[PDB]
Design a protein around this ligand. Structure first.
Ligand SMILES: [Cl-]
Ligand code: NA
Ligand SMILES: [Zn+2]
Ligand SMILES: [Zn+2]
Ligand SMILES: [Zn+2]
Lengths: 412, 412, 412
């Protein structure tokens, strides 16, 4: 069987590369939703990650940059980040990995040629190509019923194809209730100005109608470093009186992405969000006091990772997932995954892509799978050295859990 | 001499493997204490570490689990964590390492056969076997005069054999004084309800009588993330008015294990403790204001490790030790030991086992020694490359300090 | 071209070793300043880093140590840290690396011979030797107009040679204004007891006169973990009403070294400073509200590093630099540099020496360059594997930025 690191390394890498991936959180959409689905070499280069980076070098003002056309911005970013300096950053490295995967050749640095490749395909075609290259079988979307464009599709009866699943984003409802309350009553949900039984019932109705319309795998929200629960606030009262009860009834997990400090640099748009360490008290309280509720959690601060792992050791109704945003870097992904496996075995979800542009699925999963594989190799090899015997079939099983089964199993 | 990494690597590993270990903190007992000393493949599998992990997978309710028999629980944990998924976690890896060390063969996964091995031995026999395999020469125990069972032995005149040393655990006195005060006066220590000269003298008497009865290498307590000193509280007043003065007089170190948040998940029993980052202010104050007192410290939060190292650079009356609990994982042990050696040389104690079940001493020390060795190899090799010459005898000396001499030297 | 890791590794290491270094922060002085410039094997051994370490081992009281002569202290430290135990610590390793670089041989452990080497050279000669060995082209000093000795040189018209640049240290003005205000009015700066327009104008005049007299590359200050801004305090008012306006007018960057907790152990002198994690709020506020001001920042806490990197992604007027003090260790330098490059590409300054003794420049840069090189090799190799082609000339360019261009470019 397997009784050599070399043999093991090969079996593991294969299992990992071949395993069909369920990306449980992304910003992609079923191609039939139209425009909202982004793909293009230009889309890749104008990803907010690179906008932030380009602004550290270029002399072009942020206003001017926003004034430029998508292609113009893409030309500037390519010049500033790939030509004037080596594309060593993770985000840049990712653009190259995408090109290479599609069959293009970074060696030539021919942006005009790369562009021609996309110009002759359709959304549906690129989707099949990318999902095939990245070996992604299922894509969970981020569906926000507060976005006018997005809401049209849903109200018109449009459904995503079997490859894409919905997830109900509630940020506007939980974090901006004072403004959102108006739009609710505007849509027929008679919430009053004061928080009473009437408002509670309507907000629950709102949630139920959308759960019914989207059939989401989970409801989610991104929270600031200062998040706490319980709390006398709109968010605290809504989570307690509406979200949790509804989620328990429909057995839908509540996904919390904690740690983002919104718009510390407004002019940068989506590139202007920062990070902060959060207290674990609110998450600990939710897990303990709501045993019949399920929670998916990922945190933005490097300093929250270890304790999050320990918290998962305490509560089975907590499923932690991915290396989110500023954590989505080789150095962090490696330390996070090792700490996670060492204390949780395989009872967690290693990664998600958070892709905003279709092609990212390629590098996102390529870059992470190689790291995850190395970790697996070390852990399998360690028990192997302890005289334990791992079969290739067990490896495929474990890998199946990490990249797909654990999620579906949890969302039950 | 040694002028090749390969040569060095061999000399170092040998020195490390051969060096007799003094485990300065465990939850083991001199076999003559009877039952309290745990050993068994079943004991290993039901270690709270694995209980936490199994609960993340199994459908068996926590109540049912506690309802099961030791063997039943052990069967469930083996099935859920070793058969249904690969035992890649550190705690699981450790069980295998123990089996292999005793001569059993994990390859067969024959739990019934492994069990037979233990069924035919006596406590005294297993002790000699394990201590020999783990190459542990001395074991410091955790002796709590507040536990009825444990207190019987001491009051009956029972003494541990020369291989086991006592350590006075004071958690109940320091963290639960309101409840403990009653038991004290119950034992003849006339402490009053209010904290006055009378109460102070009696608590000191209590400490002195037990110091005299146990001849402990140190007095110890585990503290929450919110620990602070000075503090107007029972703990603060007791440490100031009684513990520190008595410790100085008898020249006994005060061991503080900081960072545990007790019972965040009650149902899990010993598996329900969490972690939190602590402020260094209290430790800094103690070290500076009590120069004639010695302090042994270990912290639970990953985020406290680096600053703890720096604090050790400031005060020689501080001796830091081990990679405690949630820190006892390869990824953390490696980063901790490297930061420690880089800033403290060899003036610290790398590890302790915290073993609750006898056999753990095997993997606990096996897993850590390999990591510590790798660190040593890198550090010796670095000065070697700088034209310095290290003798095998110097290596044995350094290794002697790390695994035994530093502790005994500090406890003077 | 370069299409093999081995080939790449060689090209990178060469580029790194050959690249002339601009050390943007040190405690060295142009030799013509005289005594203040420290150099010697004895100076190296009595560097506060080793004083802290020796005190963890030796029985010599701290008073006695301070009573000893420089040579006596150097003998004690050598015996205690190099002979009685292996010099595995980073600071010790550094002393050896220095010896070896100067051509001496650590293998003999002949302290008396090493000493003879220095006894026959002059300041000017050692400077040329060291700067040549360390391949350092430019050295930024720390110039404090509050130190009497240092202030004499400046008032006497003494200028440093083209290799040394001035940096205006303002700690006494910002952190000890209540005491410093007296010395100011003492020097003709008519600041009143209360903070009014008069005081503001005089403090600005003070800053302007010294900017004019030193022509500094930046103004700097070291701050405590509790640093915050805005703040109703002398520091907060001085930064707002004087420092920032003057800095904008003269386009001089403001360098903040955050995280030092001064004198937690007074007796240890310069060896008695501790560390603490800081809030990023003050830095975030400064960067956002003063877009026309430039900021150089380095932090002392390991727990501030990642977020500092993310903050740099948000603001181009923020330039982060080095692995400061307790961060200047292999384990930390590696994690810091990897996180930095992964999120910032090459838009940052990897390291500075902080040398207090001339020869340190040798090991300081030797130890860091090897680590930085390894990171570069991994990042170049990663894009190489993505089909990108890096030329040796591009590598030399990138390396030029990291070790010199980014700084000068930023200080404009
Ligand atoms: Cl932290
Ligand atoms: Na690491
Ligand atoms: Zn997202
Ligand atoms: Zn313990
Ligand atoms: Zn400095």
């Amino acid at each position: 069987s397997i009784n050599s690191r070399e043999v093991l390394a090969e079996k593991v890498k294969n299992a990992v590369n071949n395993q069909p991936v369920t990306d449980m959180h992304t910003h992609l959409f079923s191609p039939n939703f139209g425009e909202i689905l982004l793909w293009d070499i230009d889309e890749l280069l104008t990803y907010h990650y690179l906008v932030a980076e380009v602004m550290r070098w270029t002399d072009v003002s942020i206003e001017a940059f926003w004034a430029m056309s998508k292609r113009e911005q893409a030309d500037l970013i390519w010049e500033e980040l790939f030509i004037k300096r080596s594309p060593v950053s993770e985000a840049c490295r990712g653009v190259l990995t995408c090109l290479q995967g599609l069959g293009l050749d970074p060696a030539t640095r021919d942006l005009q040629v790369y562009r021609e490749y996309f110009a002759k395909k359709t959304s549906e075609e690129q989707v099949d190509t990318v999902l095939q290259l990245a070996n992604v079988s299922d894509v969970v979307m981020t569906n926000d019923p507060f976005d006018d464009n997005e809401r049209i599709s849903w109200l018109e009866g449009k459904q995503p194809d079997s490859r894409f699943h919905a997830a109900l984003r509630l940020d506007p409802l939980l974090n901006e209730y004072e403004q959102t309350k108006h739009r609710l009553r505007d849509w027929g949900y008679k919430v009053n100005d004061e928080w009473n039984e009437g408002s509670i019932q309507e907000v629950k109705r709102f949630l139920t109608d959308w759960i019914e319309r989207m059939d989401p795998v989970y409801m989610a929200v991104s929270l600031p470093p200062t998040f706490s629960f319980p709390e006398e606030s709109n968010r605290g009262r809504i989570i307690r009186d509406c979200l949790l009860p509804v989620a328990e009834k429909h057995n839908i997990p509540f996904a919390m992405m904690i740690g983002v400090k919104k718009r510390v640099h407004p002019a940068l748009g989506d590139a202007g969000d920062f990070v902060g360490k959060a207290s674990m008290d609110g998450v600990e309280h939710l897990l303990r006091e709501y045993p019949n509720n399920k929670f998916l959690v990922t945190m933005l601060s490097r300093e929250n990772q270890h304790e999050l792992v320990v918290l998962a050791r305490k509560f089975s109704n907590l499923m932690i997932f991915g290396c989110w945003w500023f954590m989505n870097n080789p150095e962090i992904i490696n330390e996070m995954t090792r700490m996670r496996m060492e204390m949780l075995g395989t009872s967690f979800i290693p990664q998600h892509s958070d892709a905003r542009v279709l092609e990212q699925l390629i590098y996102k999963w390529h870059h992470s799978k190689s790291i995850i594989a190395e970790v697996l190799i070390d852990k399998y090899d360690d028990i192997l050295q302890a005289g334990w015997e791992v079969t290739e079939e067990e490896i495929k099983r474990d890998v199946a859990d990490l990249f797909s089964r654990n999620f579906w199993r949890f969302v039950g």
